[PDB]
Each structure stands twice: as C-alpha cells, then as structure tokens.
C-alpha cells in the first residue's frame, strides 16, 4: 500500500520520498521545480525525481500541474519518456501540498552525443526514425510537443532515443516560423519543422537557422524556403503580420541539394518535405516514416498509435482547490508500468 518515506534536506530543499529511491543527488532546478538523480531500487534504474515547486500556488499553476500529470500518465511508447512513478508524502487531500514525478534518467541528450563523436548516416537515419516514431504516437493523440530540440532528446549507448520535456504552456532555433511570431494556431507539423532543423544539424554539424532575434531568424528561414505566397498569407490572422511579410523583398526557395552537398540525397529529399513554410504542406510523422530514407528501419506493424487523449479539461474554469483535487485524484489513480 503506502511505502515508507524518509525525509532529508538537500540544498535548502526538503525531499520526502519512498525508501525505494536511494542516493539522491541534486542535478538542477528552476521555475518548474527541482530535480535529483537517484537509484531506483525497485526497477534497478537511475531516475530523475522531480519535486514540483509551488504546484498549487495559483489557479494557473494548479492547472499546469494537472496538465503535466495528465500528459505524462498518458504517454506509453518506447520513444517517449513515460512516468515511472508519481507520489506525495500526503496521506489525505487536506494535507496534500507536494507532488513528485519519477522518470527514467537515460543516457545523454543529443547535444552531448554529438560532442563526443561523429555520427554516421546510419546513426542519423536511426535517430531521426525514432523521433518520428515517437511523434507519430504523440500526434495520433492530438498531442503537440511544441519544444523539440536536441536537449529534449535522450539517447543511450544502443542509440535508442526518447522524446522528453513536452511544452506545457498554453533557444528558438528549432521553432516553426508560424509559432515564433504567432502567425496562426499551432498544428502538429510544428514538431515536424523542428525535426527538420534537428536532422539538418546532425548531417552538417551546424545549426540551420541560428538567428539572434526573431526577425534575424525569420530572415534566415525565408532565405532557404522562400517568402510566403498568397495562399499562405491568407492563413495568417494578424493584419500586421501580413503587412510585415508583404513588406519583405521576395525570395525564391533555394535548391536544398546545393545547401547540403555530399549528404545522402534521400536525406536531403526528406528535409525538403519537412521544411516547407506552409505547415499544411509539410510531411506528417506517419508519412515520413514511409519515406525511403528510413527503408532499413521502417516497420509499419511496429509503429503504434496512442489511445485517444481527452483534453476537454483545458476549457474548464475551476477553483485552485478544484485543480488541486483533480491532481490528487490522478496521483491516487496512478498505476505503474509492468516491471
């Protein structure tokens, strides 16, 4: 039933966790919360134990806490970080204040991988394949990551990859132009844009659009993919945005094969399909998986989709204690994955 908890202060923060978690070592903090690496004696895995900071300090924060826990509890896929555990030392709703989330502490992120070796084209195929496999799953539940970048991808020594740190709000180099300047509502293919940016960088050893501010980055993007045509302009809601875009000197799309010389032409072809300015015309994660670049990895019987994910809570208008109570319910109903 309820584990035995033990209590310790580490770096001016109290941690009260089940004794199954041992040898906690602080590894960073922030506005989100605060994290320790630990050894999970039940699974034998190294884990990140995140203690949320001020999870219920306002309506806004309480709803965000609920949103995060709902999302993490739903994700069950080999290429997406899942929730190993969630707990509170509280014995009742009335003493409920703290929430702890436990996830696998896997390998290193994609940046650190690149720092210690040169990837082969085979590596890039397999890494991007797994990102897209994860995205097919996420997108099939109408979840959008929103914040894909190398530091949000975990990789182990077998080159196995997981997507983590979903964007929970409702650098900038990997972000689709339409969300960066708020041109329109996000669709799932903002994540596909990010993948294109990540893949380009894995192939070339250079950030694709390293802009210093929003305008500089837009200009680098438009130089590659060309300025918007009338069809895309029609979909941009802000009159000011439209006026600004129309103010730019027109530019043709570049030939990507000139931009990525010496790379696998099938890789370049996939990039052309991911980095299209109009999001409705970008390749989807499902379609990209069937792309010839991934022929050695693609298995249509092993690219699963997700259960539907009910996000109707997003339009509820509730009291702080109501979000807190819904959160508590989710802590209580949590069932760990098979050991």
């Amino acid at each position: 039933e309820r584990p035995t908890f033990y209590r310790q202060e580490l770096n001016k923060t109290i941690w009260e966790v089940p004794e199954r978690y041992q040898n906690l070592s602080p590894v960073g903090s922030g506005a989100y919360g605060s994290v320790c690496a630990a050894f999970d004696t039940k699974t034998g895995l190294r884990v990140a134990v995140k203690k949320l900071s001020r999870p219920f300090q306002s309506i806004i924060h309480a709803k965000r806490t609920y949103r995060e826990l709902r999302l993490l509890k739903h994700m069950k896929h080999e290429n997406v970080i899942g929730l190993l555990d969630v707990f509170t030392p509280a014995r009742s709703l009335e003493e409920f204040n703290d929430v702890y989330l436990v996830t696998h502490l896997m390998g290193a992120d994609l940046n650190n991988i690149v720092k210690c070796q040169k990837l082969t084209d085979d590596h890039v195929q397999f890494l991007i394949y797994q990102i897209l496999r994860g995205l097919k799953y996420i997108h099939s539940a109408d979840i959008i990551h929103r914040d894909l970048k190398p530091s949000n991808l975990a990789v182990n020594e077998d080159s196995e990859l997981k997507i983590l740190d979903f964007g929970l709000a409702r650098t900038r180099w990997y972000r689709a132009p339409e969300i960066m300047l708020n041109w329109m509502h996000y669709n799932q293919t903002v994540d596909i844009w990010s993948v294109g940016c990540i893949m380009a960088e894995l192939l070339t050893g250079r950030t694709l659009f390293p802009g210093t501010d929003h305008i500089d980055q837009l200009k680098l993007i438009l130089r590659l993919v060309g300025t918007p045509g009338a069809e895309l302009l029609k979909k941009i809601s802000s009159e000011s945005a439209r006026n600004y875009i129309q103010s730019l000197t027109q530019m043709p799309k570049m030939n990507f094969a000139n931009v990525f010389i010496g790379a696998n032409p099938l890789a370049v072809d996939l990039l052309e399909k991911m980095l299209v300015l109009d999001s409705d015309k970008r390749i989807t994660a499902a379609q990209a998986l069937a792309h010839a670049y991934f022929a050695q990895y693609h298995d249509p019987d092993d690219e699963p989709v997700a259960d539907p994910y009910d996000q109707s809570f997003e339009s509820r208008d509730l009291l702080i204690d109501e979000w807190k109570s819904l959160t508590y319910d989710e802590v209580i109903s949590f069932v760990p994955p098979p050991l």
């Binding site: 390998g107 290193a108 650190n112 991988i113 720092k115 210690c116 070796q117 082969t120 085979d122 590596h123 397999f126 990789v155 182990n156 020594e157 077998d158 080159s159 196995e160």
Partner: peptide
Amino acid sequence: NPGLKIPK
C-alpha cells in the same frame, strides 16, 4: 543497432 559513446 549502431553504438554510441555516452559522456563522459
């Protein structure tokens, strides 16, 4: 599966 060095 290709292999990788994990820092460090």
